[PDB]
Amino acid sequence: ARNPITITPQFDCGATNSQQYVARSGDTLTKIAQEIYHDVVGVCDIARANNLADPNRIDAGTPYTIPINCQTYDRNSCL
Amino acid sequence: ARNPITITPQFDCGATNSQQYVARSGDTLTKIAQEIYHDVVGVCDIARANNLADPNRIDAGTPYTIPINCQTYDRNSCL
Ligand SMILES: CC(=O)N[C@@H]1[C@@H](O)[C@H](O[C@@H]2O[C@H](CO)[C@@H](O[C@@H]3O[C@H](CO)[C@@H](O)[C@H](O)[C@H]3NC(C)=O)[C@H](O)[C@H]2NC(C)=O)[C@@H](CO)O[C@H]1O
Ligand SMILES: [Cl-]
Ligand SMILES: [Cl-]
């Protein structure tokens, strides 16, 4: 019923918008994606958005780009 | 650098995906949008998605549709 629109993604997951999230001690990608962001992004979307090799290595005090409006969600391909 | 894609929004905010969130006692649209969903949706996007008459009035135990990948965010037009 709504008209289709064309968007230009900034991430492979199709997201156009993002936030900067600074990891806290004890944060993991699963906690960030699933709890802090209430599962609106996949753990592996975050990893690819940040060009991360190992998704289990997250550094306290480092900002991570969180794509917040993905069209698709990759929860485990990088796992 | 990525190629544009065409999507069909299911909500006025441009979102294609959503979740159901069941309001807890004490919940408000503000705390749902800003804390639970970490600002990835606007208070007024939630109100419009659920055809809420009063954005200040939500019912404990009632499920609400949360558009999770809006293109635009409406934080206050309905307030
Ligand atoms: C847009 C926004 O965030 N507005 C905030 C107000 O919603 C909030 O007021 C409180 O709102 C809640 C949710 O509507 C009210 O709780 C509901 O109360 C009714 C009647 O008592 C009850 O039937 C519902 O079960 C119950 N729902 C929930 C989820 O608890 C509550 O009464 C409102 N409180 C006051 C004082 O008006 C106010 C205050 O925090 O802030 C706005 O920003
Ligand atoms: Cl990406
Ligand atoms: Cl809507």
Author numbering:
A (entry chain A), B (entry chain B): 1 to 79
Article excerpt on this structure:
The LysM effectors Mg1LysM and Mg3LysM, with one and three LysM domains, respectively, have been characterized from the Septoria tritici blotch pathogen of wheat, Z. tritici. Intriguingly, however, Mg1LysM was characterized as a functional homolog of Avr4 that protects hyphae against hydrolysis by host chitinases. The crystal structure of Mg1LysM from the Septoria blotch pathogen of wheat, Zymoseptoria tritici, revealed that chitin-induced dimerization of two Mg1LysM protomers through high affinity binding is required for hyphal protection against chitinases. Since Mg1LysM also forms ligand-independent homodimers, a supramolecular structure can be formed in which chitin-induced oligomerization of Mg1LysM ligand-independent homodimers form a contiguous Mg1LysM higher ordered structure that is anchored to the chitin in the fungal cell wall to prevent hydrolysis by host chitinases.
A native dataset was finally refined to a resolution of 2.41 Å with an Rwork and Rfree of 17.96% and 22.03%, respectively. In addition to the single LysM domain, Mg1LysM comprises a relatively long N-terminal tail that contains a short β-strand. The four Mg1LysM monomers within the a.u. form two pairs of homodimers that are each very tightly packed. In addition, the crystal structure revealed that the N-terminal 12 amino acid tails of the homodimer run anti-parallel and form a small but stable β-sheet (5ITI7 of each chain) that is stabilized by clustering of all four isoleucine side-chain residues and by threonine-threonine sidechain hydrogen bonding, potentially strengthening the homodimer. The latter hypothesis is further supported by the formation of two additional salt bridges formed between Arg2 of one subunit and Asp12 of the other one.
